[PDB]
Design a binder for this molecule. Structure first.
Ligand SMILES: [Ca+2]
Ligand SMILES: [Ca+2]
Length: 316
């Protein structure tokens, strides 16, 4: 239960040297994809920011645009992602997943459901520092209904800290969920939102087992029978995140890679955002559930420099 990333500190790091290797590979005709991809995918995000800074004092060039110009396709979208400061990545995805005429509820749901209260607190702060408004305000602007109310509950980053399992409360919650869905003519979505969004992780795990005991349906089965659309997805993401975030994301990527069209935004976002958190566990949880290493579905749906990067980002 010690979650592991795949990208770690590069020993003998030299921001200026690393920076020269980039301008040297970036400068002149086209670009030298291998040197960039193999350089970045091996340097921790922190070192990537130090390099990106050395590059600017050295040449007076903003390293990033020197990449969002010499590059294009899906390799650019990836390296650009890798370059995004860890602290700003989620808030960035949310901002652009929110400056949509349409909306990738997948991004909001994915991020706001799998991130801890501590992470959510940081995300909210940086979002209001990088852009002009509150993350909550912008969310309430592109969403409506229960899908919005669940996201707003989550965004409060208030979830109870797990501190002891009270049986009576576990049965009351399991019983309340039961009475608000399966046994209700219609649905009481508000009871689901409150339970799933504020109770502690440990408590909720105890509630999901008891719910299966008293009803015969996994909470996910009931969620499928009782809810639909955006709310269904979020509710499913919260429960799966409560059970295991590594298993959840490991699941997310499969349905992006095994779809009616490969969603490259998810394969990239999930692997980049988790590259330093638990992308190793997302791999372990992959070889066990979906039955296939993350290493392979990469080596079987992508091409060019895009692959070698992803493969090096996963870690054999
Ligand atoms: Ca050039
Ligand atoms: Ca019902």
């Amino acid at each position: 239960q010690v979650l592991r990333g795949t990208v770690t500190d590069f020993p003998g790091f030299d921001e200026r040297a690393d920076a020269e290797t980039l301008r040297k590979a970036m400068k002149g005709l086209g670009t030298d994809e291998e040197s960039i991809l193999t350089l970045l995918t091996s340097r921790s995000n922190a070192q990537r920011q130090e390099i990106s800074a050395a590059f600017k004092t050295l040449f007076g060039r903003d390293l990033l645009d020197d990449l969002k110009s010499e590059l294009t396709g899906k390799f650019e979208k990836l390296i650009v992602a890798l370059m995004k400061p860890s602290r700003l990545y989620d808030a960035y995805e949310l901002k652009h997943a929110l400056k949509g005429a349409g909306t990738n509820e997948k991004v909001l749901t994915e991020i706001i459901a799998s991130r801890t209260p501590e992470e959510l607190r940081a995300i909210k702060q940086v979002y209001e520092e990088e852009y002009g408004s509150s993350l909550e305000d912008d969310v309430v602007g592109d969403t409506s209904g229960y899908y919005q109310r669940m996201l707003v509950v989550l965004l409060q980053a208030n979830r109870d800290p797990d501190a002891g399992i009270d049986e009576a409360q576990v049965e009351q919650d399991a019983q309340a969920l039961f009475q608000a869905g399966e046994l209700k003519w219609g649905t009481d979505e508000e009871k689901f939102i409150t339970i799933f969004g504020t109770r502690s992780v440990s408590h909720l795990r105890k509630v999901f087992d008891k719910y299966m005991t008293i009803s015969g349906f996994q909470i996910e089965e009931t969620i499928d029978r009782e809810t639909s659309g955006n709310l269904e997805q979020l509710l499913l993401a919260v429960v799966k995140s409560i059970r295991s975030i590594p298993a959840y994301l490991a699941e997310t990527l499969y349905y992006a890679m095994k779809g009616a069209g490969t969603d490259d935004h998810t394969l990239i976002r999930v692997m980049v955002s988790r590259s330093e958190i638990d992308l190793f566990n997302i791999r372990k949880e992959f070889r066990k559930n979906f039955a296939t290493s993350l290493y392979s579905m990469i080596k079987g749906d992508t091409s060019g420099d895009y692959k070698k990067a992803l493969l090096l980002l996963c870690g054999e």
